[PDB]
Model the fold of this input.
Amino acid sequence: MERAEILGVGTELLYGETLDTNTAEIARSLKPYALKVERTLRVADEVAPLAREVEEAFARARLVVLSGGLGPTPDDVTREAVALALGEPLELDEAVLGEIEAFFRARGRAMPEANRKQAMRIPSATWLKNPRGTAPGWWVRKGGKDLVLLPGPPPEWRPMWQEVLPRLGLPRRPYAERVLKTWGIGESEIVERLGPLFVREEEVEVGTYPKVHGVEVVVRGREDRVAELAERIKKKLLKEVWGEGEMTLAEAVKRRMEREGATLSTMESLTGGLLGAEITRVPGASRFYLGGVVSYSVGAKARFGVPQDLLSRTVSAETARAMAEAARSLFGSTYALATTGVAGPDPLEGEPPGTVYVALAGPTGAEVRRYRFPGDRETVRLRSVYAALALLVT
Amino acid sequence: MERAEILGVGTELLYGETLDTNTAEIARSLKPYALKVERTLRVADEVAPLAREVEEAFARARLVVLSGGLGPTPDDVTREAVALALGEPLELDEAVLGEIEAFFRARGRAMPEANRKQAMRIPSATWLKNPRGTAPGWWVRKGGKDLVLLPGPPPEWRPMWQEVLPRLGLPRRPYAERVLKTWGIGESEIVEVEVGTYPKVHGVEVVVRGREDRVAELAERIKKKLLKEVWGEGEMTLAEAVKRRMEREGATLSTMESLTGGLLGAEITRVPGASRFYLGGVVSYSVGAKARFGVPQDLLSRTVSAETARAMAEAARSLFGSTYALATTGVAGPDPLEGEPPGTVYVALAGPTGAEVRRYRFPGDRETVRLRSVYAALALLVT
Ligand SMILES: O=C(O)c1ccc[n+]([C@@H]2O[C@H](COP(=O)([O-])O)[C@@H](O)[C@H]2O)c1
Ligand SMILES: O=C(O)c1ccc[n+]([C@@H]2O[C@H](COP(=O)([O-])O)[C@@H](O)[C@H]2O)c1
Done:
């Protein structure tokens, strides 16, 4: 498989001052095509370094895509750079110059001379119309290779790109992907269970991406390889997969509650309201979620029904059970979740950061799970939230 | 001026399945130093391409930083790629092995075979202790150049990178940033070395950056022009400002939240030491729950109102016995409530001398409305 290279031009994208979503979007849009994306670049607004990256990228790929640096500032050097890298000269197109003039004249303004550049092209570039902005793009065909320049702003470039893409004559390859979301299983366990199913090849591949919400397993490549390989992996992970694709844990909880016609409530400590936050992230949460308490202080725990004898060991399975049972009784809900633990940095009751109990109570009784999460304060609180949510959807 | 090269390693990074903020964060941390950053890369999880990019980045740079691919899986190939790109062999270090093993034992687990590979380094590498993961980092000093390997997730690599960065003995340049964070005043009114305004959910930030001498003076001037609007600087957050008030006063705080759904209590407890003052909260998501925690029956058909906001704050104050209490009620969206558009939000504070309400019409989606609500509630105590 040949390569596609993708370059976002702009100094501020380096620093994350503007978030570079362009290169990623452009890469997703190449999924249906038999091309390999090994890398993406963000390059500063200087012509020499940029000309070198274009030149290197173009030497290795069948396709090169640039995004941004087509404005009228001294910081807009993309045209020059592509010009310098490909050995062709910049020529003024009088016609396009008129069109730029016309864009300004439709707003009562004369065209600044700054914008004169924006009408240059190289012999090998045909133009791509930008009815939505000043800078029109280029399509270079040369040596059996395509190079495309796009404006940075997404509303300007999405339509141009969607339009020139089908035209580039790139090699199609039916593509699929399956995203499997698990919980309660680590990366190395998944490795072991899958063994040889952990394929990393040109036709199909598998990878894992540990998240606060459990380990995600993505299979991606040729349609027919992904289908059968992914189903085999789902089989191996049957009990730990809680959802697929866009599915989220809060969403999963919501469908169980609708299915049962059941209600839920919460009693939270270390997480501090974050579990309720997460439950209510999903539109429609007021149909089942009665509410919850955040019992951050000992006094608050005693007030909301944690038994006095447990108040010296709030970080325990017994307390988590009591908390969830208490919430259930206090809210009259079919289910209740509870969280108790140590987020860190400080220990509590002689237990170290990441010590966490999550409990579910319901009609037929209660259950508790124990974790030792690594992470800082924010991380432990987050994993606790998904841990509590996992109790309901295993 | 010598180069610094920055590579985020993850196929998911190419496709923005996760957004690459790592490379940019590293790049911004490097601003006080006299290196140029000409580009940053995201590389797929493939050993050969990655060795090529590493080899190349090393040949042109004074500093190379990599982030990601230190896990135990077949897709984690950063250590193999760098070994390759530096013509050195990977060698198990039995001391680190015992440390990962200790790590797993502490969690009541046996160390899985796949983790063994995380104790492997090249002879040129020094370990960077990972206080929060199994994968320590690498620091290679070779030919006056540095290459630093870091874990992908920020809670792991942040302190590592902090610890390691002064130690690289980079040439300094006198650059600085000063962030002044405001509440209750739009960009336009503010306008009335470089200076920028940045609108955030916690308010418009005024940023001053450039030559440290220029930044320090010009920033003390700006602060003065906006002396009433500026609630903090630098790393200060609304939650921390609130904490500072509660300790200064020896006061306590509690909350009753509905649309924000627990996010306010979450924000409050984001900061270490919250339990010295934050007694707790109620998430009154349903009407039945409002009733039960002391909101008057009379107000239950008008939950989106100043009256209900007031009652919620009084009800939290009485229920928990706190000095102060915050409340939120309103419409986050996508759905209207009781004829009120998304963005209609009432935040309330009750204390010793009574209660106050602020009404807001907040633009944005469900999450955005909830976030701004949380900060508006906090702003009651610190603006
Ligand atoms: O703040 C409130 O009083 C309040 C309490 C519960 C729900 N809401 C809003 O109710 C609307 C329906 O909520 P939900 O959770 O079913 O999406 C939605 O716009 C929520 O923001 C608002
Ligand atoms: O879940 C709990 O029982 C609980 C309640 C209050 C505090 N903690 C934890 O104990 C320490 C409390 O400190 P802090 O930073 O909230 O003052 C810290 O590790 C919190 O995560 C934990």
About this structure: Residues A 269-270, 296, 314-315, 340-344, 346, 348, 353; B 269, 272-276 surround nicotinate mononucleotide (ligand 2) (CB under 6 Å). Residues 331 and 337 of chain B are 6 Å apart (CA to CA). Chain B touches chain A through 82 residues (CB under 8 Å).
